[PDB]
């Protein structure tokens, strides 16, 4: 009865939303606008990625290679491995650190998947949506005025 | 939306279908290219393509034919970049037509496995089905 | 540090009245979906296009 | 911590609007032929910079006359009366 | 005293301290020269610890020596470390941004076993950084200091807990060694003994004991008295060394085939084959002492001995048995206790020497790996250590240590004391220690072992209290790294002068008396009942026969900076802590007056801080000039000491050094020859002796605020010079080359006037916010010109000159003169980073005077901003007409428990007017115990009260009642210590007498000009479009979450909408707001921010259709 | 866990038996 | 069963369901801590911002 209850919850949830769970099988995958993942050039030529560039690049490379292998007609080993790697990288991009060890880079620093921009304490939902620097502002040290 | 107001009265979340996705996108990225190494301009059909994602320069197309406001809302017939303001790159999205289907990581692995309940399979069992390590019979007579 | 995305910015009023008239052209895809492509009047319209 | 050295400077944009206004008034001090030649020569009406032959064609005169009106108008504007008003924008 | 040119400063010391203050920078210098192997440390070992030399580097080479291949055919032994001469002197390195280093040379030796050769060379190992004379590393051109760290010492920690489910004592042991593994022998809820080895699922003893070669019969043989071990023997559930060790290999190595030989070898590999297990020298000595295994045996064999394993098990089971002492066969018995992780017998000081040794090891192991890999790939009969050694790893390790590390910090040098106190600093929050979040709150308390080894007062008052402290005055670090402490040995009730140093363990063993005890001029105590300290921090009145050690002096518990606070024993610990933490923040004034009342630590804290030139060997001065002193060392030789006039410190303050000698004076070795920034005649002087009165005046000195005369500003009493550095690089760019040239696109000749020709300002031009210090023009290329701009450019006859302007401009509010300009260029072969053709640094400087908001503080924690600088006539003046200079508040004194300032005040006045003990009828009892030549004193005569043996209150009363009149017959300050002030403003006398005196107050480095900030519209962040942050940029103040709550609570909705839309993020709204303000129109209605659209595109990017539908 | 797809791949490719020039000639002729 | 619902919704549901055939849903008051009280906010936006 209880196992039915918890299952009963999500199934009716989909039934009442009328949302047809297909949203779990993600076909054509959307790409976030370029400016939200800036490639700023710090003066001196040193470019600055945003680490969403790198993850997106990984997914795109693996998708291109998968398409290529499909056209060639590689044995089931290679095609299935590459589909596995697509799935792995899409999963990494939508969250890095889940379903296995984090996908890292230089300095063995874990990357910043879209989720790590919308989770924990450094996501928008626990940060700059709390406090904002404001223009028309100042500060200074205070003294007592027994004349005002 | 594309055009916004302060009359926002309902923020409604909900999973998105790919049918809704290839109607969001203003183009499709297909090449893993960020910016040319020598001229430092975005690539065509890359991850920064101005045709897909809008100009980097205010009211200028890529090849420089149209370079002023009087040409706005139009698309230059040779480089294909729609001449407009250069903050659309904040808002225009792309999509990627995959060659094979793929599944999420949020509605599957996150405890409890929403898919795991949905199709009536345990999480570990599914982690062998959607990572290509076990067949599945879809129908039979 | 001070950096900026390689680019430029303009400061001109976005006059919505005196522009160059456009001309919407239809481009059918292989599946058949239609995708409007506004073109200028004096503008050689290409036969094919990336939609 | 990365100042975007491309943002709207706020004061720069409003200053450009004020420059537009002041220049429009000063040019309106010019005669009709003079105002027209200046606006067309520097593209103040559409953003397209018309050149001497086009301006002489739309006014139906020779380009030498256009250049002379051009020089005369420029010298008139160099006069401190209508000049010092616009110096600060530069 | 004992310093040739000592200010004659009369002390109130009733006691007589035997031992001198040590070489206050020994904790750095001796550690580093231990690392090198200098002859100084060699002779020091010859004296104490002459057993053998351990040259740091040497030990690393020996332990590494040799690198043997797996086949065992080829060996390499780098040996005999050697040092060359420093490539450049200090000042040149500091100016040209070079790291002050010296090369390392090492004799490598490669030997082939099968054929037989040795290939000896002298391999350049790398440029190793060097300590300066002041105990600092000049790394990268700055002055970085490596702070000593406190970490748990390797050893055996026997500890026990209670079990509320059973109410039984559960003892346990851990032997956490260096570069080894963890092991736990525990006694569980039942009467069995878990032996968890390397973190995985416990073990009964018997498995190991048989695997250790001990049969059940032998187990009984040694553990017969151990009824718990005998019961565990009954519980053994397994017998046999082979089977036990086999099950070991099967379990500890899960699933690994438990073949006997691999298991037998694995036992050694983990515990006895020292390549994967090395409890170091420190841990070995610690465990030797604990188990008493060996005494005279040299400290060696830095690997585990199974002999010690069985002793550990026996000691543990007897600890559970409740035994007092235990004798191990082959060693002297030891007592049975537990251990704490604070007691300084278990926390050690990984000094700079040991830290650099560890980092060099982290380098050498990588080198060894690479060397052996290449050796295997390389062909034989062709290679040599030159072709084997890769010196990249060592250089990389040393660089990443000195630069880019937590424990190598910029020497905070605001005043010399802050320098000498950034050294001698103990910091527990280092790599290999604990973070400020994993900080057990039991590590910050002053465990009673800190007495004489770490000051309980001085710690930063931020979120670091207890994690950072400072060494005591007399503390000295044991070779092993345990903080020793000097005591006096009292024998047969006779206090001697044979100073003996003791660590915390022997501090616990023996029993310690007090220095302020009645010694009867023979070493003999007087009263039998004597104050004393027992092992567990207890305080007891022992009869005067069992005391075997006495403190060397009072003020032994205390640091260097806190020992400079007069009347410290009267102040509360909170305000004394604050006083010590702000005595390091004074700024060097232009006059630098010595404190009228102080301790003995003003002279010894300057002659040892390095900011005072010292006469190296006796001589007579010949040429004394503001830049150079030439001393004629008696035997022929002469030497020119050179000053550093107006040299920028690491926090923008002056570093002048003016001489104090004349052309005919004779100097002795060790004498002060030239004052530094904060010094006067050699005595640390951080502030000025200002006249202070303690009335609350007109509410300007309300709640810690302080008012000042205008005399302080005018006569330049309080005034600090600040030298700021600006820097512009002419980096290469793709479009072209940035040229530092006078001409700049729009810059007119008016502003250009300052720039000379090269582009730099001229030395002396008074720059102000917006001036062109360095004129640099950057290529821009052709860009479109707006029609309007083209028209204006043509009408006014100004062309484009596309090359854009990016000249350096003095930051907002950073005016002053240009002291000096330093230009580095590639043409001069200056080694600028790649891409920089020219880097010019301009040193602007300003003579900041005291100002409303500047922070002033005494030596007692009584900080406060300057509420108002009143003119000189509206200041309460005395009956003599002398105005008071500051006026503190009264209400801050009694509730903060820091009446030190009051005593300092009264004594201060006594020291200014000078006293004359009315001993005509014999010395009054008030001065019966006061030293000689204190029965009378002169005006402005300097006095000193040591910290814990200072001026007894009675002494102050009598002195205050015995001052001599100023010029007329006028005793201005009566016996009570108060005076009749006249109101300078109204005129009427104050109806009640008021306390006046001379208090020594400082100028802290929290000036207003560094803090005031404003922004209307400035730079903007990149990804999000908020205003930027910090005074370096403009930035705004974070209107954080709590302020949003505050204005939600008021109900101010429109203001909240403003501050969160059209002042921070509404990108199209900000420019409209500015335009509407300038045009004088209603501020536009705000829009959606740019943090509810990035979110929307992210949610439409994580495939969650977030949409807005009004209906 | 077995999340290492490196392992998930190596254990897979360790299956098919390794071949020789003899079988290589036969295979190439068949191909 | 075991789920926690707002009182007003509970009473309104009972008012609706007494008609169309009468059956009461049995409710008992619960005391929950402030943290748990916040966790049951209806708005997903604030719920996630928590
Ligand atoms: Zn184009």
Swiss-Prot record, chain A:
Q: Which cysteines are joined by disulfide bonds?
A: none
Role, per record: DNA-dependent RNA polymerase catalyzes the transcription of DNA into RNA using the four ribonucleoside triphosphates as substrates.
Q: How does it assemble?
A: The RNAP catalytic core consists of 2 alpha, 1 beta, 1 beta' and 1 omega subunit. When a sigma factor is associated with the core the holoenzyme is formed, which can initiate transcription.
Q: Which family does it belong to?
A: Belongs to the RNA polymerase beta' chain family.
Query: Would you tell me the protein name for this molecule?
Result: DNA-directed RNA polymerase subunit beta'
Q: Which organism is it from?
A: Mycobacterium bovis (strain ATCC BAA-935 / AF2122/97)
Residues of the whole record sequence present: 289 to 436 of 1316
From Swiss-Prot, chain B:
Complex formation: The RNAP catalytic core consists of 2 alpha, 1 beta, 1 beta' and 1 omega subunit. When a sigma factor is associated with the core the holoenzyme is formed, which can initiate transcription.
The disulfides recorded in the entry are none
Protein's job: DNA-dependent RNA polymerase catalyzes the transcription of DNA into RNA using the four ribonucleoside triphosphates as substrates.
Its recorded name reads DNA-directed RNA polymerase subunit beta'
Location of this fragment in the whole protein? 1 to 140 of 1316
Q: Which organism is it from?
A: Mycobacterium bovis (strain ATCC BAA-935 / AF2122/97)
Residue numbers binding Zn(2+) 1: 61, 63, 76, 79
- What gene name is listed for this protein? rpoC
What family does the entry list? Answer: Belongs to the RNA polymerase beta' chain family.
Swiss-Prot record, chain C:
Describe its assembly: Forms a complex with the RNAP catalytic core and with free principal sigma factors.
Name the protein family: Belongs to the RNA polymerase-binding protein RbpA family.
Its annotated function is as follows:
Binds to RNA polymerase (RNAP), stimulating transcription from principal, but not alternative sigma factor promoters.
Q: Which named protein is this?
A: RNA polymerase-binding protein RbpA
What is the scientific name of the source organism? Mycobacterium tuberculosis (strain CDC 1551 / Oshkosh)
Which residues of the parent protein does this chain contain? 6 to 56 of 111
UniProtKB/Swiss-Prot annotation, chain G:
Family, similarity comment: Belongs to the RNA polymerase beta' chain family.
Q: How does it assemble?
A: The RNAP catalytic core consists of 2 alpha, 1 beta, 1 beta' and 1 omega subunit. When a sigma factor is associated with the core the holoenzyme is formed, which can initiate transcription.
Q: What does this protein do?
A: DNA-dependent RNA polymerase catalyzes the transcription of DNA into RNA using the four ribonucleoside triphosphates as substrates.
Q: Could you identify this protein by its name?
A: DNA-directed RNA polymerase subunit beta'
């Amino acid at each position: 009865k209880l196992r039915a209850l918890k299952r009963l919850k999500v199934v009716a949830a989909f039934q009442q939303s009328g949302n047809s769970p297909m949203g779990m099988v993600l076909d054509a995958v959307p790409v976030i606008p370029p400016e939200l993942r800036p490639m700023v050039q710090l003066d001196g030529g040193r470019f600055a990625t945003s680490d969403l560039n790198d993850l997106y690049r990984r997914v795109i490379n693996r998708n291109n290679r998968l398409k290529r292998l499909i056209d060639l007609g590689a044995p089931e080993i290679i095609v299935n491995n590459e589909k596995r790697m697509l799935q792995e990288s899409v999963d990494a991009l939508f969250d890095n650190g889940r379903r296995g060890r984090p996908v890292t880079g230089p300095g063995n620093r874990p990357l910043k998947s879209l989720s790590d921009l919308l989770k924990g304490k450094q996501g928008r939902f626990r940060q700059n949506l709390l406090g904002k620097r404001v223009d028309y502002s100042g500060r200074s040290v205070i003294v007592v005025g027994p004349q005002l | 939306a594309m055009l916004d107001v302060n009359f926002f009265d309902e923020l409604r979340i909900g999973l998105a279908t790919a049918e809704d996705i290839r109607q969001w996108s203003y183009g499709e990225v297909k090449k893993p290219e960020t910016i040319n190494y020598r001229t430092l301009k975005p690539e065509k059909d890359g991850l920064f393509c101005e045709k897909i994602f809008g100009p980097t320069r205010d009211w200028e197309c890529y090849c420089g034919k149209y370079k002023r406001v009087r040409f706005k809302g139009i698309i230059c017939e040779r480089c294909g970049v729609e001449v407009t303001r250069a903050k659309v790159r904040r808002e225009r999205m792309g999509h990627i037509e995959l060659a094979a289907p793929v599944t999420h990581i949020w509605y599957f692995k996150g405890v409890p496995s929403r898919l795991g309940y949905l199709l009536d399979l345990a999480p570990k069992d599914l982690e062998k089905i959607i990572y290509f390590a076990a067949y599945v019979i879809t129908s039979v007579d | 540090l001070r950096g900026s995305r390689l680019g430029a910015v303009s400061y001109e009023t976005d006059r919505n009245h005196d522009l160059a008239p456009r001309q919407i052209a239809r481009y059918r895809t292989d599946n058949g979906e239609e995708f409007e492509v506004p073109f200028a009047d004096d503008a050689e319209i290409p036969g094919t296009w990336l939609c | 911590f990365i100042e975007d050295s491309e943002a709207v400077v706020a004061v720069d944009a409003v200053s450009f609007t004020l420059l537009q206004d002041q220049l429009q008034s000063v040019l309106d001090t010019l005669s009709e032929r003079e105002a027209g030649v200046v606006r067309l020569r520097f593209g103040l009406t559409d953003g397209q910079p018309r050149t001497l032959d086009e301006i002489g064609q739309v006014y139906g005169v020779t380009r030498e006359r256009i250049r002379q009106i051009e020089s005369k108008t420029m010298s008139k504007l160099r006069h401190p009366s209508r000049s010092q008003v616009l110096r600060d924008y530069l | 005293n004992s310093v040739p040119g000592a200010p004659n400063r009369v002390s109130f010391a009733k006691l007589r301290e035997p031992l001198e203050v040590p070489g206050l920078l020994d904790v750095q210098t001796d550690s580093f020269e231990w690392l090198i192997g200098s002859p100084r440390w060699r002779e020091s070992a010859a004296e104490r610890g002459d057993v053998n030399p351990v040259g740091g580097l040497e030990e690393v080479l020996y332990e590494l020596s040799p690198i043997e291949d797996f086949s065992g055919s080829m060996s390499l032994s780098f040996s005999d470390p050697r040092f060359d001469d420093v490539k450049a002197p200090v000042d040149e390195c500091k100016d040209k941004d070079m790291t002050y280093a010296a090369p390392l040379f090492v004799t490598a030796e490669f030997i082939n076993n099968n054929t037989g050769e040795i290939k000896s060379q002298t391999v350049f190992m790398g440029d190793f950084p060097m300590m300066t004379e002041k105990g600092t590393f000049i790394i990268n051109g700055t002055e970085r200091v490596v702070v000593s760290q406190l970490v748990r010492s390797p050893g055996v920690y026997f500890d026990e807990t209670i079990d509320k489910s059973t109410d039984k004592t559960l003892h346990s042991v851990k032997v956490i060694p260096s570069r080894g593994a963890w092991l736990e022998f525990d006694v569980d809820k039942r009467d069995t003994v878990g032996v968890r080895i390397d973190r995985k699922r416990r073990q009964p003893v018997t498995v190991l004991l048989k695997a250790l070669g001990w049969t059940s019969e032998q187990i009984v043989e040694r553990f017969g008295f151990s009824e718990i071990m005998r019961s565990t023997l009954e519980k053994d559930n397994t017998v046999g060394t082979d089977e036990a060790l086999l099950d070991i290999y099967r379990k500890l190595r899960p699933g690994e085939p438990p073949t006997k030989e691999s298991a037998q070898t694995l036992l050694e590999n983990l515990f006895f084959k020292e390549k994967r297990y090395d409890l170091a020298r420190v841990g070995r000595y610690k465990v030797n002492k604990k188990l008493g295994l060996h005494v005279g045996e040299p400290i060696t064999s830095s690997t585990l001995t199974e002999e010690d394993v069985v002793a550990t098990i026996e000691y543990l089971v007897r600890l559970h048995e409740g035994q007092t002492t235990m004798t191990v066969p082959g060693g002297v018995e030891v007592p049975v206790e537990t251990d704490d992780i604070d007691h300084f017998g278990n926390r050690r000081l990984r000094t700079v020497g040991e830290l650099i040794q560890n980092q060099i090891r982290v380098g050498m192991s990588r080198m060894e790996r690479v060397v052996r890999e290449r050796m295997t790939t390389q062909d034989v009969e062709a290679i040599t250590p030159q072709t084997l050694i890769n010196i990249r790893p060592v250089v990389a390790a040393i660089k990443e240590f000195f630069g880019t590390s937590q424990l190598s910090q910029f020497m905070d040098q605001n005043n010399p004391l802050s320098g000498l106190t950034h050294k001698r600093r103990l910091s527990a929050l280092g790599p290999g220690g604990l973070s400020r979040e994993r900080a057990g709150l039991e590590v910050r308390d002053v465990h009673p072992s800190h007495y004489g080894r770490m000051c309980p007062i001085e710690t930063p008052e931020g979120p670091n209290i207890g994690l950072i402290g400072s060494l005591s005055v007399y503390a000295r670090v044991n070779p092993f790294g345990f903080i020793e402490t000097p005591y006096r040995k009292v024998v047969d009730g006779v206090v001697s002068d044979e100073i003996v140093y003791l660590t915390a363990d022997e501090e616990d063993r023996h029993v310690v008396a007090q220095a302020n005890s009645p010694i009867d001029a023979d070493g003999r105590f007087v009263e039998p009942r004597v104050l004393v300290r027992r092992k567990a921090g207890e305080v007891e009145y022992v009869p005067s026969s069992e005391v075997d050690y006495m403190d060397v002096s009072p003020r032994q518990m205390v640091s260097v900076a806190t020992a400079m606070i007069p009347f410290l024993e009267h102040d509360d610990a909170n305000r004394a802590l604050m006083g010590a933490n702000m005595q390091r923040q004074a700024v060097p004034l232009v006059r630098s007056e010595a404190p009228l009342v102080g301790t003995g630590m003003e002279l010894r804290a300057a002659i040892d801080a390095g900011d005072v030139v010292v006469a190296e060997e006796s001589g007579v001065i010949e040429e004394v000039s503001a830049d150079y002193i030439t001393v004629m060392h008696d035997n022929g030789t002469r030497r020119t000491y050179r000053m550093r006039k107006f040299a920028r410190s690491n926090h923008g303050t002056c570093a002048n050094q003016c001489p104090i000698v004349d052309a005919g004076d004779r100097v002795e070795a060790g004498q002060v020859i030239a004052d530094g920034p904060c010094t006067d005649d050699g005595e640390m002087a951080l502030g000025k002796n200002l006249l202070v009165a303690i009335m609350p005046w007109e509410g300007h000195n309300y709640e810690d605020a302080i008012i000042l005369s205008n005399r302080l500003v005018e006569e330049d009493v309080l005034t600090s010079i600040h030298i700021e550095e600006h820097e512009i690089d002419a980096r290469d760019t793709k479009l072209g080359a940035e040229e530092i040239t006078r001409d700049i696109p729009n810059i007119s000749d008016e502003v250009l006037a300052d720039l000379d020709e090269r582009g730099i300002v001229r030395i002396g031009a008074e720059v102000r916010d917006g001036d062109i210090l360095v004129g640099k023009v950057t290529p821009k290329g052709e860009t479109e010109l707006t029609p309007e701009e083209r028209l204006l450019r043509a009408i006014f006859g100004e062309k484009a000159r596309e090359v854009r302007d990016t000249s350096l401009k003095v930051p907002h509010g950073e005016s002053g003169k240009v002291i000096g300009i330093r230009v580095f260029s590639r043409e001069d072969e200056d080694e600028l980073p790649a891409g920089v053709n020219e880097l010019v640094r301009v040193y602007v400087a300003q003579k900041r005077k005291i100002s409303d908001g500047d922070k002033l503080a005494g030596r007692h924690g009584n900080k406060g901003v300057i509420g108002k600088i009143l003119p000189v006539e509206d200041m309460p003046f005395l009956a003599d007409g002398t105005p008071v200079d500051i006026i503190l508040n009264t209400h801050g004194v009694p509730r903060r428990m820091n009446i030190g300032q009051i005593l300092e005040t009264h004594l201060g006045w006594c020291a200014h007017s000078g006293w004359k003990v009315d001993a005509a009828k014999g010395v009054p009892d008030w001065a019966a115990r006061l030293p000689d030549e204190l029965l009378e004193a002169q005006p402005n005569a300097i006095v000193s009260t040591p910290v814990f043996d200072g001026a007894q209150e009675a002494e102050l009363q009598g002195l205050l009642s015995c001052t001599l009149p100023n010029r007329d017959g006028d005793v201005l300050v009566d016996a009570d210590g108060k005076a009749m002030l006249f109101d300078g403003r109204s005129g009427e006398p104050f109806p009640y007498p008021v306390t006046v005196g001379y208090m020594y107050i400082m100028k802290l480095h929290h000036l207003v000009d560094d803090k005031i900030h404003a922004r209307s519209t400035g730079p903007y962040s990149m990804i999000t479009q908020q205003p930027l942050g910090g005074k370096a940029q403009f930035g705004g103040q974070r209107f954080g979450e709590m302020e949003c709550w505050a204005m939600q609570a008021y109900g101010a909705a429109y203001t909240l909408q403003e501050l969160l839309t059209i002042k921070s993020d509404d990108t199209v709204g900000r420019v409209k707001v500015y335009e509407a303000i300038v045009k004088g129109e209603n501020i536009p209605e705000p829009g959606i921010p740019e943090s509810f659209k990035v979110l929307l595109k992210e949610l439409q990017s994580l495939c969650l259709n977030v949409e807005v539908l009004s209906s | 866990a077995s999340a290492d797809s490196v392992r998930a791949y190596l254990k897979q490719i360790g299956k098919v038996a390794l071949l020789n020039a003899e079988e290589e000639v036969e295979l190439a002729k068949r191909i | 069963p075991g789920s926690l619902i707002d009182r007003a919704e509970f009473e309104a549901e009972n008012r609706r369901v007494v008609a169309e055939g009468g059956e009461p849903a049995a409710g008992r008051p619960v005391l929950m801590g402030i943290t748990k009280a916040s966790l049951a906010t209806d708005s997903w936006l604030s719920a996630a911002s928590f």
